[PDB]
Amino acid sequence: MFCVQCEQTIRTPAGNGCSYAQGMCGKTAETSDLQDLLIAALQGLSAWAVKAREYGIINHDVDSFAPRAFFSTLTNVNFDSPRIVGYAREAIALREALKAQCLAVDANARVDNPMADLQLVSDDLGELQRQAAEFTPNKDKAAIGENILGLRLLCLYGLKGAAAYMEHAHVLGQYDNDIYAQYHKIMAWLGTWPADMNALLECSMEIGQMNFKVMSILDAGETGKYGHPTPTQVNVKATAGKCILISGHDLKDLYNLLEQTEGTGVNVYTHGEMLPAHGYPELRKFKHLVGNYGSGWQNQQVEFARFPGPIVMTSNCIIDPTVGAYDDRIWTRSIVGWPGVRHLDGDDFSAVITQAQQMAGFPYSEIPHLITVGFGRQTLLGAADTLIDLVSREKLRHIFLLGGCDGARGERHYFTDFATSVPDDCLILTLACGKYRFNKLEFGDIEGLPRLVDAGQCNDAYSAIILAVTLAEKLGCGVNDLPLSLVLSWFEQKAIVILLTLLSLGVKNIVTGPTAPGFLTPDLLAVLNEKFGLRSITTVEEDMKQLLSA
């Protein structure tokens, strides 16, 4: 068992990632090995899906399936082993079903597909299954250059994050077929174990390109489904009676859970990456979504435990529910999976509504306290020519992007401290669950424009990127001539992929912490420090000064 995709892998002097028996995040050898097999099935599929060789044409099913499956191998998404084997099941079903369509035409020359992952068919039963040992991401650990492995992983791990966005784009109603072609090529090529440090870097930038396309399209879905987030204040206190809290990234599930509970008199609370839902007008319309509860995925355990009603996990950042003994009342949706905790497929929430009604709910409201959220792609560009004014009257000193995931380690204090200690004459543009790091602390404004400007969700770095571009557009300059640096936090594959696209956009002088990834060797991350000056955090006061100045 070996993977290292999260900011929280095993972290040791010798080596990088989690091997051993279990993950740090609760995945077992079983899963994390089975997940490897699913990735291999998946990669083969994608190689046959690259099979519109001249005009072999495309099946939306395969296209639209591949990300959704890959998404399950993601961190804190899925830890139920059967589910994962089953994703592999139907990957191969469609590789085979796919093969037939092309095979009625020219009998695939000499080789239908020259592929490592090939047909990759499999035998049955889980424990006795795990022959995925042949597929682990580092079977050639020392049989390939260690720096080649690092680029390789950051290429796959990265693409993973992109697929998450492809899906929770798709689901919100949008895809593109050229993107799908690019997905499959990249996945197909990653299938074939190959490692050429030149093309790994160069196909780690192209993932960046693609990820932007798809974040393009996913910000396209959110705006079109539920409006353009306009700036909006959210209560983070508890209120009144019975409640269901919904966590994760899928706005669809909240719009449904909202209609279904419409005047049922049970209330909706968001948590984690569901916060920025609140800014969306066709979603904030509801009088029952009361507030937003708790903070940061890193502590579901002790907070979900305290929340009266049931919890609905839309996607990602789920951990072991057994600890807080709330496993009866967590409902995994979509591709989220945890063994033995109820999975709610279908768009019928009434199961969990009635469950919410059985429970305590809240005993009162607390004296409320609101934060401000939903600086939309739209509403951010709204700000720009006033950002440029404020800067152009030495009112706005420089803009700071405190961003990316929350994790668990105390070393994350950095982000909180960084944020308060940003000087009183410059903005924060935050955008992720690490928003929760400094999010409820007091910030003030610069002439009305709030100093803490939430942009929404990890997936909304696309918003942040686009603000910068329109600032560079406007100030006749270039993206890092801009008076903004980026001090991003990170935890999983989506934030890897945002780093890729940020790098691919060519934004130089990024500051990931609170540590840098497990598969980036001091060599390699020094190569990134060659090409893009990407440096780690480690110190709040130093890094403040470095960044303010010319």
Ligand code: SF4
């Ligand atoms: S998800 Fe992260 S913590 Fe869990 S096994 Fe994989 S790398 Fe380790």
